[PDB]
């Protein structure tokens, strides 16, 4: 049942076995039931750790491929190993995106849930964009922006700049403009406005809100 | 080829994908050739991360069930989950122990090679002992330590890192498994004191690091 899979997923998180944690929360969503405020956090933390290992491995192997130019063997090995990580990375994102489109986004009856899943949809399309080679990158980048844009319009309309979902969405959206679209100016504009509007509204969950605001100012300092 | 498997193993270590790293070194061991000083380190680091991820997961799940005395439902799930990690942990060690007794320890040529694979045997039996067959695994673990301790004591210097590393893992075996916190402190202190009385540029780091861990084990045990 649901409570059995959720409790086992909480055990897999403590044991740091996120592949077991992901399969448990995937089954909870595949039952057609709208997730609670805790079940969607477990599903997110699960696949983010699963997808993060491939991303971290992809960056290292890709850096080696760029650095091993001149030695075709050391560079082709890195190329082929990277391509295998890419296939693992693509299957994970397609698993989450198909999970978001079939069960999560349609059943979302609250704007809080809808912005969360839409931001999550823009993220895993952005993770596919970091790896795309061509022909399909144009659409993947567009599909990532559309999910981000719809999430940004709902959040800015029905959430406050102190809400952690809106701040985190502005953080990931600005990263999308900077690293994917190569627009380092709208990235700073998105991050600075969301950071200043959060202070101006300031002018429980505030621990997450303060952390994201520090991440916004840090991205601004790095991009400058 | 041997070069491709090792090169990918070095590459899998950088990507932190030790399941692929262990599978490559297992294929190098399956080819029967005696592993070089670099290959035996890559094989060890590979399976140490693979077998250590299940050890860390096992310590967490069992510690959670100790506080679940009130609820019998959660106690079953934690018990069932712990047993699945135990089955994973058993299959990993038996995989290493099979390679040790079939390809590795048999073809052990030079002395330094014979001592390293002999230490690795007692370790993965010690990992099995951490989880009737108990005394059978514990004694099977002890003989590999003693056999390697005699060889390293007779033909190696107390400054060699393989001799110092074996003394460290042997001392841990007495404390955690045999519950002998005192017969091990002598072994750790003798191997430490026999080295301070006395080494190459390619060996100080591994040698001096183990001695630091030796005195750190002695301090921890003597609370």
């Amino acid at each position: 049942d649901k409570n059995e899979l959720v409790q086992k997923a909480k055990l897999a998180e403590q044991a740091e076995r996120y592949d077991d944690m992901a399969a448990c929360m995937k089954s909870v969503t595949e039952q057609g039931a709208e997730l609670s405020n805790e079940e969607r956090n477990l599903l997110s933390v699960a696949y983010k750790n699963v997808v993060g290992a491939r991303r971290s491995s992809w960056r290292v192997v890709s850096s080696i491929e760029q650095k091993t130019e001149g030695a075709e063997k050391k560079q082709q090995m890195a190329r082929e190993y990277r391509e295998k990580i890419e296939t693992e990375l693509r299957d994970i994102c397609n698993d989450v995106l198909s999970l978001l489109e079939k069960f999560l986004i349609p059943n979302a009856s609250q704007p809080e849930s809808k912005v969360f899943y839409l931001k999550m949809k823009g993220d895993y399309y952005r993770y596919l964009a970091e790896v795309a080679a061509g022909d399909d990158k144009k659409g993947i980048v567009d599909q990532s922006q559309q999910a981000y844009q719809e999430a940004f319009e709902i959040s800015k309309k029905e959430m406050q700049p102190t809400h952690p979902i809106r701040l985190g969405l502005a953080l990931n959206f600005s990263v999308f403009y900077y690293e994917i679209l190569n627009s380092p100016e709208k990235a700073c504009s998105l991050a600075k406005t969301a950071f200043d509007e959060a202070i101006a509204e300031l002018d429980e969950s505030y621990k997450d809100s303060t952390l994201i605001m520090q991440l916004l100012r840090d991205n601004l300092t790095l991009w400058t | 080829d041997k070069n491709e498997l090792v090169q990918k193993a070095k590459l899998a270590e950088q990507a932190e994908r030790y399941d692929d790293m262990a599978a490559c070194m297992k294929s190098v061991t399956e080819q029967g050739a005696e592993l070089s000083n670099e290959e035996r380190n890559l094989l060890s680091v590979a399976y140490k991360n693979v077998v250590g991820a299940r050890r860390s997961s096992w310590r967490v799940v069992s510690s959670i069930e100790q506080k679940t005395e009130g609820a019998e439902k959660k106690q079953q799930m934690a018990r069932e989950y712990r047993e699945k990690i135990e089955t994973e942990l058993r299959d990993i060690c038996n995989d290493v122990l099979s390679l040790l007794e079939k390809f590795l320890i048999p073809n052990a040529s030079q002395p330094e090679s014979k001592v390293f694979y002999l230490k690795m045997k007692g370790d993965y039996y010690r990992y099995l002992a951490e989880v009737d067959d108990k005394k059978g695994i514990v004694d099977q673990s002890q003989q590999a330590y003693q056999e390697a301790f005699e060889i390293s004591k007779k033909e190696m210097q107390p400054t060699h890192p393989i001799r110092l590393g074996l003394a460290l893992n042997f001392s841990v075996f007495y404390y955690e498994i045999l519950n002998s916190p005192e017969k091990a402190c002598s072994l750790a202190k003798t191997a430490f004191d026999e080295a301070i009385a006395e080494l190459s540029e390619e060996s100080y780091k591994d040698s001096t690091l183990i001695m630091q861990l030796l005195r750190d084990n002695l301090t921890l045990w003597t609370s």
């Binding site: 993220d123 985190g168 953080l171 990931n172 990263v175 900077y178 690293e179 994201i212 991440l215 840090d218 991205n219 790095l222 991009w223 | 370790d123 590393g165 460290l168 893992n169 841990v172 404390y175 955690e176 183990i210 861990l213 750190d216 084990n217 921890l220 045990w221």
Partner: peptide, 12 residues
Amino acid sequence: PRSNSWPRSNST
């Protein structure tokens, strides 16, 4: 640099 998004006995 990357952009930001949202006791025991020792052995050898």
